[PDB]
Amino acid sequence: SIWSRIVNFGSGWGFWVSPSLFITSTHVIPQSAKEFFGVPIKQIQIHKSGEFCRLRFPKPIRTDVTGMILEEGAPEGTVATLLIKRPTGELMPLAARMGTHATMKIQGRTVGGQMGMLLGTTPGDCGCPYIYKRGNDYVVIGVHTAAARGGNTVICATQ
Ligand SMILES: *[C@@H](CC(=O)OCC)[C@H](C[C@@H]1CCNC1=O)NC(=O)[C@@H](CC(=O)[C@@H](NC(=O)c1cc(C)on1)C(C)C)Cc1ccc(F)cc1
């Protein structure tokens, strides 16, 4: 069901934090769109923080979902879940030990987020959420935006 909150968005994915809040990667959002989920884009309030893209809709869109906790990253050492959906529809939950929070430079651009280590990702996976459980509540910490071409290093864009 939480998987139902991940939906094809442009060249990547996005996630319904609530019935009205939708988050994605800044590299994924369709730049020349005049409508999202039937809503005129003029009616949608979009905020961009580096690679974190945040879409507040005027009315609730996903009335079936509940509002989730959204925070700027996770505590260091937290083993997070990277909920990756592939174009085939396959579900690919990946374990990632979250690392330090920082302003990072990625392909010349400045990105606020949190490094992680997979315990693979591909171009089409951007916009997919990082989530961990804290008590009884699941917590969204950000969206996938990059991965180093060396070893295991993923970037979760935050804020
Ligand atoms: C997701 C976005 C995408 O496909 O858009 C094309 C620009 C994609 C995911 C990676 C592709 C391969 N595997 C992935 O997980 N991300 C990108 O294309 C960003 C750039 C990268 O991922 C490079 N990675 C890095 O520079 C890097 C550095 C560190 C510590 O970690 N990763 C490639 C080596 C893949 C696009 C991007 C993101 C943010 C920016 F500020 C600029 C550019």
Residue numbers in the entry: 4 to 122, 133 to 172
Sentences from the paper on this structure:
To ascertain that similar conformational changes in the BII-CII loop occur in other GII-Pros in response to rupintrivir binding, we first determined the crystal structures of apo GII.4-Pro Sydney (2012 GII.4 variant) and GII.3-Pro to 2.4 Å and 2.6 Å, respectively, followed by their crystal structures in complex with rupintrivir to 2.5 Å and 2.71 Å resolution. These structures show that the BII-CII extends from the closed conformation to the same open position observed in GI.1-Pro. The R112 sidechain orients away from the active site, adopting a conformation similar to that observed in GI.1-Pro to accommodate the P2 sidechain of rupintrivir. Unlike the GII.4-Pro HOV-rupintrivir structure, the BII-CII loop is not involved in any crystal contact in these two structures. As a result, the BII-CII loop does not adopt the hyperextended conformation. While remaining the same in the GII.4-Pro Sydney and GII.3-Pro structures, this sidechain adopts a different conformation in the GII.4-Pro HOV structure with a hyperextended BII-CII loop. In GII-Pros, but not GI.1-Pro, the BII-CII loop switches from a closed state to an open state to accommodate rupintrivir. Interestingly, in the recently published structure of GII.4-Pro Sydney in complex with NV-004, a potent aldehyde-based inhibitor of the SARS-CoV-2 main protease with HuNoV protease inhibition activity, the BII-CII loop exists in a different conformation compared to our rupintrivir bound GII-Pro structures. In the NV-004 bound structure, the loop conformation results in a narrower S2 pocket and a wider S4 pocket, suggesting that in exchange for stability, the BII-CII loop matches its conformation to the bound ligand to attain the most favorable conformation.
